[PDB]
């Protein structure tokens, strides 16, 4: 005598939305606060005044 939404099973499809998916990414703090010294080797030596 009547058709309910449970009786129409999967003739009604469920949809998708990525509108919550896109999280923004945060860089390193020290790579923007301080100088980025370019290196071409494992070890660099820096002399400093000590006495």
């Amino acid at each position: 005598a009547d058709i309910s939404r449970a009786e129409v099973a999967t003739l009604i499809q469920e949809a998708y939305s990525d509108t919550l998916l896109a999280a923004a990414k945060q860089g390193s703090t020290v790579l923007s606060a301080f100088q980025n010294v370019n290196m071409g080797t494992k070890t660099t030596h820096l002399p400093v005044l000590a006495t």
């Binding site: 005598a1 009547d2 058709i3 009786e7 129409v8 099973a9 999967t10």
Partner: protein
Amino acid sequence: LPEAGWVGESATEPEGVIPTSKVTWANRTLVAEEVAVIIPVPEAVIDDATV
């Protein structure tokens, strides 16, 4: 499945009234499952073969 009925021309008798009926559906699923094999062979055997 719904069921229909024969209906008289009347504005007063119960036989003048068209029956209501429902239709209903259920769900079945295709679920994909993986079948696979690995066939190892010497690279020399593969390089040697003309077929």
